[PDB]
Every structure is written in C-alpha cells, then in structure tokens.
Amino acid sequence: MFENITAAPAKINLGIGVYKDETGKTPVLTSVKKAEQYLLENETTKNYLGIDGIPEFGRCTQELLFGKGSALINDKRARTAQTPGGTGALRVAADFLAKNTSVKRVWVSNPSWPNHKSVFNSAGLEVREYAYYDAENHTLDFDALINSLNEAQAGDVVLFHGCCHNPTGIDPTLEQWQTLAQLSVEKGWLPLFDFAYQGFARGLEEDAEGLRAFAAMHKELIVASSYSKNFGLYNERVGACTLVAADSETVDRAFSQMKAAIRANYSNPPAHGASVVATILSNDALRAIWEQELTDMRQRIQRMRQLFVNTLQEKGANRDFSFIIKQNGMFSFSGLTKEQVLRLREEFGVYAVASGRVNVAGMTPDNMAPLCEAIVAVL
Amino acid sequence: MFENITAAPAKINLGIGVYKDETGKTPVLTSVKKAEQYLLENETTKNYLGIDGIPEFGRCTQELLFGKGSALINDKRARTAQTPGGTGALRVAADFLAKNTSVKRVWVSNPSWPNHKSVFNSAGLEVREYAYYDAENHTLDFDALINSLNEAQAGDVVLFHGCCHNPTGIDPTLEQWQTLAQLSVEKGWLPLFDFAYQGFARGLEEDAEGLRAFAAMHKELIVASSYSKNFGLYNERVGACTLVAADSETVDRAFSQMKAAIRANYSNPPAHGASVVATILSNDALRAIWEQELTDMRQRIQRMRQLFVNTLQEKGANRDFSFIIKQNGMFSFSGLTKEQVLRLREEFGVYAVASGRVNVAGMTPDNMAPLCEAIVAVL
Ligand SMILES: Cc1ncc(COP(=O)(O)O)c(CNc2csc(C(=O)O)c2)c1O
Numbered sequence: 238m239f240e241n242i243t244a245a246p247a248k249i250n251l252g253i254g255v256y257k258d259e260t261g262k263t264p265v266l267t268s269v270k271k272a273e274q275y276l277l278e279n280e281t282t283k284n285y286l287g288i289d290g291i292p293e294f295g296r297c298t299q300e301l302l303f304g305k306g307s308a309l310i311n312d313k314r315a316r317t318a319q320t321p322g323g324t325g326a327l328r329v330a331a332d333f334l335a336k337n338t339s340v341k342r343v344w345v346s347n348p349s350w351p352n353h354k355s356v357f358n359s360a361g362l363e364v365r366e367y368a369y370y371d372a373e374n375h376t377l378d379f380d381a382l383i384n385s386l387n388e389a390q391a392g393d394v395v396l397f398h399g400c401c402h403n404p405t406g407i408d409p410t411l412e413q414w415q416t417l418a419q420l421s422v423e424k425g426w427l428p429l430f431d432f433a434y435q436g437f438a439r440g441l442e443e444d445a446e447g448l449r450a451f452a453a454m455h456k457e458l459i460v461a462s463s464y465s466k467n468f469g470l471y472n473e474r475v476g477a478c479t480l481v482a483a484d485s486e487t488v489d490r491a492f493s494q495m496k497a498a499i500r501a502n503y504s505n506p507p508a509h510g511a512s513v514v515a516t517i518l519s520n521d522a523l524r525a526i527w528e529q530e531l532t533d534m535r536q537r538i539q540r541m542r543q544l545f546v547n548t549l550q551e552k553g554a555n556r557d558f559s560f561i562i563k564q565n566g567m568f569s570f571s572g573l574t575k576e577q578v579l580r581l582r583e584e585f586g587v588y589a590v591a592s593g594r595v596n597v598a599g600m601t602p603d604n605m606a607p608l609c610e611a612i613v614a615v616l
Numbered sequence: 617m618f619e620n621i622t623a624a625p626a627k628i629n630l631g632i633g634v635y636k637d638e639t640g641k642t643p644v645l646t647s648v649k650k651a652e653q654y655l656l657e658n659e660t661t662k663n664y665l666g667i668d669g670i671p672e673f674g675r676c677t678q679e680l681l682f683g684k685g686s687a688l689i690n691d692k693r694a695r696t697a698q699t700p701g702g703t704g705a706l707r708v709a710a711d712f713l714a715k716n717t718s719v720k721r722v723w724v725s726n727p728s729w730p731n732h733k734s735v736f737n738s739a740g741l742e743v744r745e746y747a748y749y750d751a752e753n754h755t756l757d758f759d760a761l762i763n764s765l766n767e768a769q770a771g772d773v774v775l776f777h778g779c780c781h782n783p784t785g786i787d788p789t790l791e792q793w794q795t796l797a798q799l800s801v802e803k804g805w806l807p808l809f810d811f812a813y814q815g816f817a818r819g820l821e822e823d824a825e826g827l828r829a830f831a832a833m834h835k836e837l838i839v840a841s842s843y844s845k846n847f848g849l850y851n852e853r854v855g856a857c858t859l860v861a862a863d864s865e866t867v868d869r870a871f872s873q874m875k876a877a878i879r880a881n882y883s884n885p886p887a888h889g890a891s892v893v894a895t896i897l898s899n900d901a902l903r904a905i906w907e908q909e910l911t912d913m914r915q916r917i918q919r920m921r922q923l924f925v926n927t928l929q930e931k932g933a934n935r936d937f938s939f940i941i942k943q944n945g946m947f948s949f950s951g952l953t954k955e956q957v958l959r960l961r962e963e964f965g966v967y968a969v970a971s972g973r974v975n976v977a978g979m980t981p982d983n984m985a986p987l988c989e990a991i992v993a994v995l
C-alpha cells in the first residue's frame with residue numbers, strides 16, 4: 238500500500254515562529270502558570286468537554302472579538318467552537334464550508350502564511366491569491382488588492398488577517414477596512430478572518446477594529462482565532478472558530494453542522510490550554526496580569542523595530558528601513574532577496590525565511606549589533 | 617451563505633461513555649495529578665511540539681503496542697504521531713489514506729462506535745460493514761464475519777477493535793486473531809487497529825496480543841490508539857496514529873505525508889495530556905502507580921459484571937445473563953430491545969443506548985439493586 242508514496246515537500250534565529258523575550262527565551266507566561274496551578278488544585282475530572290469546548294472560553298472569545306455589548310453578542314448571532322489552535326479553527330471552518338455550502342474557492346493574500354493553502358486544499362477548496370504588498374513603498378498596495386479581488390465571485394470566501402499580517406506586518410488602516418467591508422457586502426464575499434495576533438499591533442480593542450467594521454456590515458462571517466502567541470500557549474493548541482449568521486435560529490442550525498465537522502475530526506477539543514485562557518480571561522486579577530504581559534510583549538517588539546532601524550543606520554546601511562517602525566507584530570519583510578538571505582545564513586549564521594521575512598521578536602539588545610553588521614555586509 | 621443549511625442529525629446513567637468509580641465519579645488519576653504537578657514545576661516553555669509530538673510519547677506508545685524488543689521497533693518500521701485523541705488518530709489515518717493511497721473503502725464491524733462512519737466519510741472514504749455479533753449465543757459470529765469480509769477487495773482497509781470491542785465487549789480469541797491475520801495477508805487488506813481500551817480486558821500485554829499477531833504477519837498496518845480511558849485523560853485529547861511499513865525507508869517516506877495531513881488539520885498536537893502520559897510511562901514510580909490504577913479500573917468493571925449477573929438472578933430475571941461475565945471492557949449489549957430501553961428511561965429513569973448497550977462501569981454496588989429491579993420489570 239505504501240511502497241510508492243512520494244515524500245512530502247519541505248548565530249541568530251529570525252526564522253523562528255514564536256515570541257522571545259530579551260533573554261532569547263519563550264517562557265510560560267506568569268498568568269498562565271498561576272492559572273495552571275489553580276487548575277491542578279481544583280480540577281476533579283478530565284471528563285470530555287462538549288464538541289464546542291468550554292462555554293466560558295467561547296463567551297470570553299466573543300467579547301475579545303466583538304467587544305462587550307456588541308449587537309452580535311446581544312442578538313445571539315455568533316457561536317464559538319474551541320479548537321486545537323488557529324490552524325484547527327481554519328480547518329474546521331474549511332470542512333464546514335466544503336460540506337455545507339456552495340463555497341469552492343478561498344482568496345488569500347499574496348503573500349500569506351504558507352499553511353493557508355494546505356489547510357483549505359485539504360478540505361477540497363481551491364485557493365486564489367489577491368495582491369497585497371507594494372514592495373517599493375513597503376506598504377499595502379490597496380489599489381492592486383481591490384483590482385485582484387474584483388475577480389472574486391459572489392459566494393467566494395475572502396480571507397483577511399485581522400491584524401499583524403503574516404508575513405508583512407502591513408495591515409489595512411481603519412478606513413481601508415471600512416472600504417473593504419463595504420466592497421465585501423456589495424460583491425457577496427463571505428469574510429473569513431484569521432486572527433492569530435490580537436494584541437500585538439496596537440492593543441486588544443484596536444486590533445479588532447477591522448473585524449468589528451466587517452461585523453457591523455455583514456450578516457455572515459467566520460473568525461478563526463488563536464491564543465498561541467498572545468498567551469504564549471503555542472503547544473497547548475488553543476484557538477476558536479466563531480460562526481456568525483443573520484440571526485440566532487440560523488447560526489444555531491449552521492453551527493450544528495460545524496459541530497458535526499469537529500466530531501468527525503478530533504471529537505472534542507483539548508481542555509488544558511483553553512481552560513487556562515478561560516480562567517485568566519474571566520478573573521479580574523489574572524486578566525490584568527495577562528494583559529500587562531501581552532502589553533510587555535507588544536512593546537518589546539516595538540522597541541526592537543526601532544532599535545533595528547537605528548542600528549542598521551549606525552552600522553552604515555545607508556538605505557531607508559523606516560518602514561519597519563510602522564509595521565505591526567512579530568514579522569516584517571526586510572527587503573533582502575533570497576540570495577542575500579542565503580548569504581546571511583551561510584556566511585554569517587543569521588537565519589531568516591527566503592522571502593526575507595524576519596521575526597523582530599528574535600532580536601534582542603544583545604544580538605542586534607552583530608545582526609545588523611551581517612545585514613549591512615550583504616546589501 | 618448559511619440560510620439553507622440543514623441541521624445536523626442526532627435515576628442511573630448507563631449511557632455514559634467514561635469510567636466511573638464506586639462513588640460514581642470520574643476523578644483525575646493520582647498518577648496524572650502527580651505528573652501534572654511535575655509539569656507545572658518543570659516546564660519552562662510552551663513552544664510548539666513537532667508535527668508528530670513528543671518523541672518519548674511515541675517511543676512509549678510503540679512499546680505498549682508492540683512490546684519492548686519487538687522486531688517492528690528494532691527494525692525502525694513504525695512511526696508514531698501524537699494526535700488529539702483516538703478520534704484524531706483515526707481522522708489523520710483516514711486523511712493520510714485518502715490522499716496518498718488507492719484506498720476507497722474501510723470495513724467496520726456491525727455494530728461499531730457510530731463515529732467511525734463519520735470520520736472515514738469525512739475523508740471521502742466509503743464505509744462497508746462486516747458481520748460480527750451472534751445475538752443468540754451473545755458471542756462473536758466468526759463464520760459470518762469471515763463470510764462478510766470475503767466481499768472486501770485487495771487494497772481495502774479493514775478496521776479491527778484491538779480489545780474491548782465497542783459496543784459488544786466481544787473480542788476475538790488469540791486463535792481467531794491469528795486466523796484473521798492470515799486471512800488479511802492472503803486477501804491483501806490493510807489492517808487498521810483502533811485501540812482505545814488497552815488494559816481494560818485482561819491486561820496491557822494480553823490486550824495487545826491480537827495486534828501483535830497481525831504485526832507479526834504484515835508488512836503494513838496502522839494503529840489509532842487512545843489514552844482517554846486508560847489514563848482517564850478524556851478531555852486532554854491524547855492519542856496516537858502509528859504507521860508501520862515494510863522497512864524504515866518506506867515508513868519514513870510514507871510518514872512524511874502523514875505529517876503533511878496533520879499540518880493541514882491542526883498543525884501540531886496538544887502537549888499537556890501527552891506530556892502527562894510520557895512522564896508517567898517513562899518513570900518507573902509513576903508508571904507503577906498508573907498501572908495499578910488501571911488494574912483497579914479493570915477489576916472494578918469485572919466485579920460489576922459479576923454483580924450485575926448475580927443481582928439480575930436474585931431479582932428474578934430467570935434469563936441467562938452469564939455472557940456478561942465473559943465480555944470485556946466497559947460495554948456490553950444487555951439484550952434489551954429498543955422499546956425496553958425506552959421503557960427503562962421513561963418508567964424507571966435508567967438510561968442506556970437504544971441498541972441496549974450498557975456501560976458496566978456506570979454500575980456500582982449502591983445503584984445495582986434498583987437497576988436490576990428496573991431491568992427485571994421490563995423483561
Ligand atoms: C496568520 C496565521 N494563521 C494561522 C496560524 C496558526 O496558529 P496556531 O495554529 O499556531 O494557533 C498562525 C500562527 N502559526 C504559526 C506558527 S509559526 C508561524 C510563522 O509564520 O512563522 C505561524 C498565523 O500567523
């Protein structure tokens with residue numbers, strides 16, 4: 238059966254995918270440790286969660302996404318399933334859409350996270366790309382984006398990164414999100430928000446502005462969110478798939494099929510990480526400690542963005558890198574070519590992805606001068 | 617998009633799906649609590665696991681399945697991916713097979729766990745049923761099983777419950793497993809073992825006899841195993857998908873595509889529960905405490921089987937229920953009809969599934985007399 242299977246395709250780490258602190262560690266957040274000790278002391282069973290996971294986790298997720306007092310929440314228009322990470326939320330969404338709707342195609346930005354194509358194709362959905370990145374101004378090529386998406390038909394899904402676009406760190410402005418929201422309603426797209434970095438651009442509420450501008454205009458949308466980065470809970474697989482429909486009767490009926498797609502995949506979701514999140518978000522004291530830890534991560538990344546720009550200038554780059562200051566989250570394109578990236582790895586032991594994307598959170602005050610010296614050497 | 621979606625289809629609890637102790641609780645195992653405290657004290661990161669999860673978890677899983685010193689292990693013929701439960705292992709297997717092989721059909725016993733059909737159909741695989749249960753002798757209808765499976769073509773998958781068949785509690789004898797192993801090689805079936813109850817029939821090693829008789833005869837097989845019940849880790853989603861091929865080069869190449877199927881589903885697996893299992897299995901002291909807790913569960917179930925038979929006789933059933941003593945694991949068919957089960961629920965508040973399957977682990981010395989009185993009333 239297996240004998241002819243084809244194999245699947247495939248000093249400083251800026252090619253890393255997680256946050257690192259100033260010491261180069263990815264420690265467990267203190268709010269998380271305190272929550273884990275509470276769970277150790279208080280859990281009395283590991284009995285299965287429901288298919289959609291812990292109710293409090295869903296409520297706290299919808300409040301983070303839509304805002305407390307949102308009409309979507311008051312009108313009971315949203316249902317949330319706790320999932321194994323943001324990736325599990327995207328796959329549950331894809332399997333739900335493939336089996337229960339006429340969707341055939343999902344539009345993803347060029348560039349995006351490479352796993353988007355794999356997830357949607359796994360569910361039998363085609364992936365099409367829309368333009369996104371203006372590499373001369375290192376900005377959002379909004380006109381190209383809109384022009385690309387005019388090829389999208391009514392009933393196609395359009396995927397939007399909610400904030401901290403991966404890999405570019407370039408997000409729509411609020412006004413651009415409002416223009417996209419209007420266009421999406423006019424063209425009949427189903428928005429799918431991928432929200433893996435809430436809190437890493439400007440703040441929890443600010444980072445949800447774009448999603449909330451869409452939610453104000455749409456009857457229907459799906460959000461695949463992740464707590465991997467903003468709780469430092471990567472390996473516990475903590476995410477959510479939130480389905481929104483015009484009204485409670487419709488969302489409840491549609492969500493029953495989302496639960497069927499979960500049941501046929503992994504049955505019900507892993508409790509530990511989500512219970513940590515629910516414990517933190519629903520407790521005033523733990524939530525305050527966590528919100529500050531997230532602010533500390535967001536601010537450290539901003540300090541590294543500024544220190545990277547300043548240091549490249551001090552090391553004689555003689556090139557404008559100011560675009561780095563304005564970009565959001567852990568990732569940016571450095572503007573280096575694939576061969577410069579290869580040179581950086583081979584000659585200097587500095588590791589980035591071939592696109593030139595770097596994880597700014599991999600930078601520290603200690604490793605900045607050698608990193609920048611290496612980059613200047615390959616310009 | 618969603619407005620026309622069709623909804624998905626759907627005193628004493630013997631309809632429960634988990635183990636209960638003599639007090640009717642499903643507590644966290646003590647070995648698990650001790651392991652969780654060790655993890656709280658010692659984890660310094662939640663950084664992502666590899667796609668296939670924790671290496672020690674895979675090694676300890678292969679030793680439980682195949683035996684320490686197995687040729688399959690020595691020859692590096694098996695690769696294990698940690699998965700979100702037994703269900704996640706079955707879905708990873710199904711998606712791997714659908715995308716990478718000629719498999720179109722999986723043969724499942726009639727009866728089985730109802731979620732088997734959902735999982736395989738989700739991956740685009742057809743499910744066919746083979747005969748299994750002789751309801752007059754309350755035994756394995758071996759001749760019917762073999763006759764059914766003669767319709768299976770070379771290259772079809774045949775699913776076997778490794779022990780504690782769900783729902784019947786009726787397992788092949790060793791000699792029957794050896795006959796099936798031989799037949800499977802002759803007919804070109806790919807065996808898929810579903811092993812959710814190792815340790816609940818006779819013992820860890822005894823319960824793997826059938827799988828090991830298959831492994832001795834086959835170049836290729838897949839095992840989807842679960843630690844939900846034997847570690848009481850239901851909601852932490854702890855299972856494994858083990859791929860076996862003729863040799864290391866082949867299994868490694870095939871496993872690369874199994875990892876691709878995981879990456880497109882949930883990316884990488886949840887650490888907490890699997891790390892508990894690896895911590896317990898790789899430590900002599902914790903493993904001894906856990907093995908005794910499992911023996912205690914297995915023995916309590918056997919005591920309930922005996923007490924149920926004896927009590928039905930004392931309460932005047934006047935019918936042979938001795939078959940219950942010989943069946944394995946938490947489940948048995950009581951032999952009650954769907955209407956007797958409905959009567960039991962409505963008139964007596966005793967809850968079983970419509971097939972008449974009961975969870976013997978839901979029985980306690982305290983609830984046995986009323987339960988048996990209720991059953992006698994509906995005969
Ligand atoms: C846009 C987007 N979508 C989905 C995901 C998946 O998140 P988790 O499944 O890890 O929660 C992520 C985060 N997953 C991820 C891990 S490393 C990485 C990278 O781009 O390096 C990405 C993301 O950035």
Ligand SMILES: Cc1ncc(COP(=O)(O)O)c(CNc2csc(C(=O)O)c2)c1O
Binds near residue numbers: 700
């Ligand atoms: C034969 C078989 N295959 C797969 C599974 C899935 O196990 P987990 O996904 O819960 O680990 C199980 C256990 N899942 C399960 C939970 S309740 C239940 C039942 O039949 O009541 C079954 C099983 O018995």
